[PDB]
PDB file of all heavy atoms in Angstrom:
ATOM      1  N   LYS A   1       6.873  -9.343  -9.284  1.00  0.00           N
ATOM      2  CA  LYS A   1       6.498  -8.465  -8.186  1.00  0.00           C
ATOM      3  C   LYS A   1       7.516  -7.358  -7.946  1.00  0.00           C
ATOM      4  O   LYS A   1       7.147  -6.220  -7.636  1.00  0.00           O
ATOM      5  CB  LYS A   1       6.315  -9.272  -6.890  1.00  0.00           C
ATOM      6  CG  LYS A   1       5.938  -8.428  -5.672  1.00  0.00           C
ATOM      7  CD  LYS A   1       5.638  -9.279  -4.439  1.00  0.00           C
ATOM      8  CE  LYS A   1       5.326  -8.375  -3.264  1.00  0.00           C
ATOM      9  NZ  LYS A   1       6.480  -7.543  -2.846  1.00  0.00           N
ATOM     10  N   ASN A   2       8.800  -7.678  -8.100  1.00  0.00           N
ATOM     11  CA  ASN A   2       9.881  -6.714  -7.837  1.00  0.00           C
ATOM     12  C   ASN A   2       9.868  -5.596  -8.890  1.00  0.00           C
ATOM     13  O   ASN A   2      10.135  -4.432  -8.543  1.00  0.00           O
ATOM     14  CB  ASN A   2      11.244  -7.416  -7.790  1.00  0.00           C
ATOM     15  CG  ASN A   2      11.457  -8.237  -6.518  1.00  0.00           C
ATOM     16  OD1 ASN A   2      12.325  -9.100  -6.461  1.00  0.00           O
ATOM     17  ND2 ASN A   2      10.652  -7.968  -5.498  1.00  0.00           N
ATOM     18  N   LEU A   3       9.542  -5.941 -10.130  1.00  0.00           N
ATOM     19  CA  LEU A   3       9.469  -4.905 -11.180  1.00  0.00           C
ATOM     20  C   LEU A   3       8.373  -3.922 -10.816  1.00  0.00           C
ATOM     21  O   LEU A   3       8.590  -2.720 -10.822  1.00  0.00           O
ATOM     22  CB  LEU A   3       9.192  -5.529 -12.546  1.00  0.00           C
ATOM     23  CG  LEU A   3       9.114  -4.568 -13.742  1.00  0.00           C
ATOM     24  CD1 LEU A   3      10.421  -3.808 -13.947  1.00  0.00           C
ATOM     25  CD2 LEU A   3       8.740  -5.338 -14.994  1.00  0.00           C
ATOM     26  N   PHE A   4       7.190  -4.419 -10.474  1.00  0.00           N
ATOM     27  CA  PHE A   4       6.095  -3.536 -10.087  1.00  0.00           C
ATOM     28  C   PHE A   4       6.461  -2.653  -8.885  1.00  0.00           C
ATOM     29  O   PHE A   4       6.158  -1.485  -8.882  1.00  0.00           O
ATOM     30  CB  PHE A   4       4.806  -4.302  -9.754  1.00  0.00           C
ATOM     31  CG  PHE A   4       3.811  -4.292 -10.881  1.00  0.00           C
ATOM     32  CD1 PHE A   4       3.752  -5.343 -11.779  1.00  0.00           C
ATOM     33  CD2 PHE A   4       2.931  -3.229 -11.034  1.00  0.00           C
ATOM     34  CE1 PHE A   4       2.824  -5.343 -12.812  1.00  0.00           C
ATOM     35  CE2 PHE A   4       2.011  -3.211 -12.059  1.00  0.00           C
ATOM     36  CZ  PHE A   4       1.966  -4.265 -12.961  1.00  0.00           C
ATOM     37  N   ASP A   5       7.131  -3.235  -7.892  1.00  0.00           N
ATOM     38  CA  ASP A   5       7.563  -2.472  -6.714  1.00  0.00           C
ATOM     39  C   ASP A   5       8.520  -1.316  -7.071  1.00  0.00           C
ATOM     40  O   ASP A   5       8.509  -0.278  -6.412  1.00  0.00           O
ATOM     41  CB  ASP A   5       8.190  -3.377  -5.658  1.00  0.00           C
ATOM     42  CG  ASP A   5       7.151  -4.245  -4.951  1.00  0.00           C
ATOM     43  OD1 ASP A   5       5.982  -3.832  -4.804  1.00  0.00           O
ATOM     44  OD2 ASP A   5       7.520  -5.359  -4.518  1.00  0.00           O
ATOM     45  N   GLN A   6       9.306  -1.507  -8.131  1.00  0.00           N
ATOM     46  CA  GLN A   6      10.136  -0.427  -8.681  1.00  0.00           C
ATOM     47  C   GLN A   6       9.313   0.650  -9.399  1.00  0.00           C
ATOM     48  O   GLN A   6       9.732   1.806  -9.450  1.00  0.00           O
ATOM     49  CB  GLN A   6      11.179  -0.993  -9.666  1.00  0.00           C
ATOM     50  CG  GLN A   6      12.239  -1.874  -9.064  1.00  0.00           C
ATOM     51  CD  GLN A   6      13.186  -1.102  -8.162  1.00  0.00           C
ATOM     52  OE1 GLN A   6      13.816  -0.146  -8.611  1.00  0.00           O
ATOM     53  NE2 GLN A   6      13.288  -1.527  -6.913  1.00  0.00           N
ATOM     54  N   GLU A   7       8.170   0.260  -9.992  1.00  0.00           N
ATOM     55  CA  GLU A   7       7.419   1.192 -10.845  1.00  0.00           C
ATOM     56  C   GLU A   7       6.258   1.899 -10.138  1.00  0.00           C
ATOM     57  O   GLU A   7       5.800   2.942 -10.575  1.00  0.00           O
ATOM     58  CB  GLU A   7       6.856   0.474 -12.071  1.00  0.00           C
ATOM     59  CG  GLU A   7       7.921  -0.119 -12.975  1.00  0.00           C
ATOM     60  CD  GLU A   7       8.909   0.914 -13.451  1.00  0.00           C
ATOM     61  OE1 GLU A   7       8.465   2.008 -13.836  1.00  0.00           O
ATOM     62  OE2 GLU A   7      10.140   0.640 -13.410  1.00  0.00           O
ATOM     63  N   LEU A   8       5.806   1.308  -9.034  1.00  0.00           N
ATOM     64  CA  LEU A   8       4.707   1.897  -8.257  1.00  0.00           C
ATOM     65  C   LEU A   8       5.195   3.123  -7.525  1.00  0.00           C
ATOM     66  O   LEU A   8       6.378   3.236  -7.190  1.00  0.00           O
ATOM     67  CB  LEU A   8       4.147   0.856  -7.297  1.00  0.00           C
ATOM     68  CG  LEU A   8       3.411  -0.310  -7.950  1.00  0.00           C
ATOM     69  CD1 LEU A   8       3.250  -1.449  -6.952  1.00  0.00           C
ATOM     70  CD2 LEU A   8       2.043   0.087  -8.500  1.00  0.00           C
ATOM     71  N   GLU A   9       4.263   4.066  -7.259  1.00  0.00           N
ATOM     72  CA  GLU A   9       4.560   5.284  -6.527  1.00  0.00           C
ATOM     73  C   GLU A   9       4.747   5.040  -5.024  1.00  0.00           C
ATOM     74  O   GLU A   9       5.628   5.641  -4.388  1.00  0.00           O
ATOM     75  CB  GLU A   9       3.497   6.329  -6.773  1.00  0.00           C
ATOM     76  CG  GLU A   9       3.516   6.812  -8.220  1.00  0.00           C
ATOM     77  CD  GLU A   9       2.629   8.015  -8.505  1.00  0.00           C
ATOM     78  OE1 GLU A   9       1.941   8.515  -7.599  1.00  0.00           O
ATOM     79  OE2 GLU A   9       2.607   8.442  -9.677  1.00  0.00           O
ATOM     80  N   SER A  10       3.931   4.160  -4.451  1.00  0.00           N
ATOM     81  CA  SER A  10       4.097   3.803  -3.041  1.00  0.00           C
ATOM     82  C   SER A  10       4.986   2.547  -3.011  1.00  0.00           C
ATOM     83  O   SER A  10       4.648   1.508  -3.569  1.00  0.00           O
ATOM     84  CB  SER A  10       2.762   3.560  -2.382  1.00  0.00           C
ATOM     85  OG  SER A  10       2.901   3.208  -1.033  1.00  0.00           O
ATOM     86  N   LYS A  11       6.114   2.652  -2.328  1.00  0.00           N
ATOM     87  CA  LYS A  11       7.160   1.653  -2.486  1.00  0.00           C
ATOM     88  C   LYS A  11       7.386   0.837  -1.216  1.00  0.00           C
ATOM     89  O   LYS A  11       6.881   1.160  -0.136  1.00  0.00           O
ATOM     90  CB  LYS A  11       8.461   2.316  -2.942  1.00  0.00           C
ATOM     91  CG  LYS A  11       8.415   2.731  -4.393  1.00  0.00           C
ATOM     92  CD  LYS A  11       9.431   3.799  -4.712  1.00  0.00           C
ATOM     93  CE  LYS A  11       9.174   4.436  -6.064  1.00  0.00           C
ATOM     94  NZ  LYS A  11       9.295   3.454  -7.154  1.00  0.00           N
ATOM     95  N   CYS A  12       8.162  -0.221  -1.369  1.00  0.00           N
ATOM     96  CA  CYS A  12       8.601  -1.017  -0.228  1.00  0.00           C
ATOM     97  C   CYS A  12       9.482  -0.135   0.672  1.00  0.00           C
ATOM     98  O   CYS A  12      10.228   0.697   0.163  1.00  0.00           O
ATOM     99  CB  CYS A  12       9.348  -2.260  -0.731  1.00  0.00           C
ATOM    100  SG  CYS A  12       8.267  -3.439  -1.550  1.00  0.00           S
ATOM    101  N   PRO A  13       9.414  -0.335   2.006  1.00  0.00           N
ATOM    102  CA  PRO A  13       8.580  -1.293   2.723  1.00  0.00           C
ATOM    103  C   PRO A  13       7.109  -0.861   2.776  1.00  0.00           C
ATOM    104  O   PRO A  13       6.810   0.315   2.977  1.00  0.00           O
ATOM    105  CB  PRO A  13       9.189  -1.300   4.137  1.00  0.00           C
ATOM    106  CG  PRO A  13       9.782   0.044   4.271  1.00  0.00           C
ATOM    107  CD  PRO A  13      10.310   0.405   2.919  1.00  0.00           C
ATOM    108  N   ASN A  14       6.205  -1.808   2.597  1.00  0.00           N
ATOM    109  CA  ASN A  14       4.774  -1.517   2.549  1.00  0.00           C
ATOM    110  C   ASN A  14       4.190  -1.348   3.940  1.00  0.00           C
ATOM    111  O   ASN A  14       4.790  -1.760   4.931  1.00  0.00           O
ATOM    112  CB  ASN A  14       4.049  -2.642   1.816  1.00  0.00           C
ATOM    113  CG  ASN A  14       4.440  -2.751   0.373  1.00  0.00           C
ATOM    114  OD1 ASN A  14       4.621  -1.748  -0.317  1.00  0.00           O
ATOM    115  ND2 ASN A  14       4.563  -3.962  -0.102  1.00  0.00           N
ATOM    116  N   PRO A  15       3.007  -0.735   4.043  1.00  0.00           N
ATOM    117  CA  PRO A  15       2.374  -0.551   5.350  1.00  0.00           C
ATOM    118  C   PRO A  15       2.244  -1.839   6.185  1.00  0.00           C
ATOM    119  O   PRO A  15       1.767  -2.875   5.689  1.00  0.00           O
ATOM    120  CB  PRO A  15       0.990  -0.019   4.995  1.00  0.00           C
ATOM    121  CG  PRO A  15       1.165   0.675   3.707  1.00  0.00           C
ATOM    122  CD  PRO A  15       2.271  -0.051   2.977  1.00  0.00           C
ATOM    123  N   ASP A  16       2.677  -1.748   7.439  1.00  0.00           N
ATOM    124  CA  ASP A  16       2.486  -2.814   8.431  1.00  0.00           C
ATOM    125  C   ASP A  16       1.055  -2.798   8.961  1.00  0.00           C
ATOM    126  O   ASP A  16       0.478  -3.841   9.262  1.00  0.00           O
ATOM    127  CB  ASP A  16       3.446  -2.630   9.591  1.00  0.00           C
ATOM    128  CG  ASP A  16       4.892  -2.675   9.177  1.00  0.00           C
ATOM    129  OD1 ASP A  16       5.353  -3.781   8.810  1.00  0.00           O
ATOM    130  OD2 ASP A  16       5.561  -1.605   9.201  1.00  0.00           O
ATOM    131  N   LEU A  17       0.538  -1.577   9.115  1.00  0.00           N
ATOM    132  CA  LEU A  17      -0.779  -1.351   9.691  1.00  0.00           C
ATOM    133  C   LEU A  17      -1.512  -0.266   8.896  1.00  0.00           C
ATOM    134  O   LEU A  17      -0.877   0.750   8.542  1.00  0.00           O
ATOM    135  CB  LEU A  17      -0.612  -0.905  11.144  1.00  0.00           C
ATOM    136  CG  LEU A  17      -1.792  -0.272  11.909  1.00  0.00           C
ATOM    137  CD1 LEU A  17      -2.874  -1.296  12.161  1.00  0.00           C
ATOM    138  CD2 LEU A  17      -1.302   0.308  13.209  1.00  0.00           C
ATOM    139  N   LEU A  18      -2.794  -0.448   8.655  1.00  0.00           N
ATOM    140  CA  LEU A  18      -3.653   0.609   8.124  1.00  0.00           C
ATOM    141  C   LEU A  18      -4.706   1.006   9.169  1.00  0.00           C
ATOM    142  O   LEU A  18      -5.416   0.148   9.732  1.00  0.00           O
ATOM    143  CB  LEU A  18      -4.301   0.227   6.822  1.00  0.00           C
ATOM    144  CG  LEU A  18      -5.237   1.335   6.286  1.00  0.00           C
ATOM    145  CD1 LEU A  18      -5.049   1.585   4.791  1.00  0.00           C
ATOM    146  CD2 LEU A  18      -6.686   0.996   6.573  1.00  0.00           C
ATOM    147  N   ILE A  19      -4.794   2.317   9.416  1.00  0.00           N
ATOM    148  CA  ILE A  19      -5.826   2.883  10.257  1.00  0.00           C
ATOM    149  C   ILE A  19      -6.787   3.662   9.375  1.00  0.00           C
ATOM    150  O   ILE A  19      -6.366   4.532   8.602  1.00  0.00           O
ATOM    151  CB  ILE A  19      -5.213   3.825  11.339  1.00  0.00           C
ATOM    152  CG1 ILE A  19      -4.296   3.026  12.279  1.00  0.00           C
ATOM    153  CG2 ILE A  19      -6.315   4.541  12.116  1.00  0.00           C
ATOM    154  CD1 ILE A  19      -3.444   3.897  13.177  1.00  0.00           C
ATOM    155  N   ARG A  20      -8.081   3.329   9.456  1.00  0.00           N
ATOM    156  CA  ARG A  20      -9.098   4.143   8.839  1.00  0.00           C
ATOM    157  C   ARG A  20     -10.079   4.639   9.895  1.00  0.00           C
ATOM    158  O   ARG A  20     -10.748   3.853  10.584  1.00  0.00           O
ATOM    159  CB  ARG A  20      -9.847   3.373   7.759  1.00  0.00           C
ATOM    160  CG  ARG A  20     -11.087   4.100   7.280  1.00  0.00           C
ATOM    161  CD  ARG A  20     -11.613   3.564   5.949  1.00  0.00           C
ATOM    162  NE  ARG A  20     -12.655   4.437   5.430  1.00  0.00           N
ATOM    163  CZ  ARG A  20     -13.045   4.478   4.162  1.00  0.00           C
ATOM    164  NH1 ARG A  20     -12.477   3.701   3.228  1.00  0.00           N
ATOM    165  NH2 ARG A  20     -13.987   5.363   3.790  1.00  0.00           N
ATOM    166  N   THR A  21     -10.171   5.958  10.009  1.00  0.00           N
ATOM    167  CA  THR A  21     -11.101   6.634  10.915  1.00  0.00           C
ATOM    168  C   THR A  21     -12.448   6.727  10.207  1.00  0.00           C
ATOM    169  O   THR A  21     -12.547   6.529   9.004  1.00  0.00           O
ATOM    170  CB  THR A  21     -10.555   8.024  11.323  1.00  0.00           C
ATOM    171  OG1 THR A  21     -10.186   8.746  10.143  1.00  0.00           O
ATOM    172  CG2 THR A  21      -9.312   7.868  12.167  1.00  0.00           C
ATOM    173  N   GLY A  22     -13.481   7.049  10.976  1.00  0.00           N
ATOM    174  CA  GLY A  22     -14.770   7.408  10.389  1.00  0.00           C
ATOM    175  C   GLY A  22     -15.755   6.265  10.239  1.00  0.00           C
ATOM    176  O   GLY A  22     -16.885   6.465   9.808  1.00  0.00           O
ATOM    177  N   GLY A  23     -15.322   5.029  10.540  1.00  0.00           N
ATOM    178  CA  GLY A  23     -16.246   3.907  10.683  1.00  0.00           C
ATOM    179  C   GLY A  23     -16.536   3.023   9.469  1.00  0.00           C
ATOM    180  O   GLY A  23     -17.026   1.908   9.647  1.00  0.00           O
ATOM    181  N   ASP A  24     -16.268   3.499   8.259  1.00  0.00           N
ATOM    182  CA  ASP A  24     -16.448   2.632   7.086  1.00  0.00           C
ATOM    183  C   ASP A  24     -15.315   1.583   7.032  1.00  0.00           C
ATOM    184  O   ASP A  24     -14.174   1.902   7.381  1.00  0.00           O
ATOM    185  CB  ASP A  24     -16.494   3.435   5.778  1.00  0.00           C
ATOM    186  CG  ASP A  24     -17.165   2.673   4.627  1.00  0.00           C
ATOM    187  OD1 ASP A  24     -17.781   1.606   4.888  1.00  0.00           O
ATOM    188  OD2 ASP A  24     -17.081   3.123   3.480  1.00  0.00           O
ATOM    189  N   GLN A  25     -15.635   0.366   6.607  1.00  0.00           N
ATOM    190  CA  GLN A  25     -14.666  -0.723   6.543  1.00  0.00           C
ATOM    191  C   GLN A  25     -14.365  -1.097   5.103  1.00  0.00           C
ATOM    192  O   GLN A  25     -14.707  -2.187   4.616  1.00  0.00           O
ATOM    193  CB  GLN A  25     -15.130  -1.935   7.374  1.00  0.00           C
ATOM    194  CG  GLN A  25     -15.478  -1.587   8.813  1.00  0.00           C
ATOM    195  CD  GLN A  25     -15.286  -2.744   9.815  1.00  0.00           C
ATOM    196  OE1 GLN A  25     -15.257  -2.496  11.029  1.00  0.00           O
ATOM    197  NE2 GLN A  25     -15.140  -3.972   9.330  1.00  0.00           N
ATOM    198  N   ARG A  26     -13.695  -0.167   4.407  1.00  0.00           N
ATOM    199  CA  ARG A  26     -13.223  -0.348   3.043  1.00  0.00           C
ATOM    200  C   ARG A  26     -11.841   0.249   2.894  1.00  0.00           C
ATOM    201  O   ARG A  26     -11.427   1.072   3.724  1.00  0.00           O
ATOM    202  CB  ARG A  26     -14.127   0.391   2.047  1.00  0.00           C
ATOM    203  CG  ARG A  26     -15.588   0.045   2.094  1.00  0.00           C
ATOM    204  CD  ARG A  26     -16.315   0.899   1.067  1.00  0.00           C
ATOM    205  NE  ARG A  26     -17.550   0.273   0.621  1.00  0.00           N
ATOM    206  CZ  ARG A  26     -18.790   0.645   0.946  1.00  0.00           C
ATOM    207  NH1 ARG A  26     -18.987   1.663   1.769  1.00  0.00           N
ATOM    208  NH2 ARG A  26     -19.830  -0.047   0.478  1.00  0.00           N
TER     209      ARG A  26
END
């Protein structure tokens, strides 16, 4: 997991909360 976290573009710390507007739940 740590190797991937080094290689991914979005890095740790990861989102605590996600907000999606517009009403779709995906």
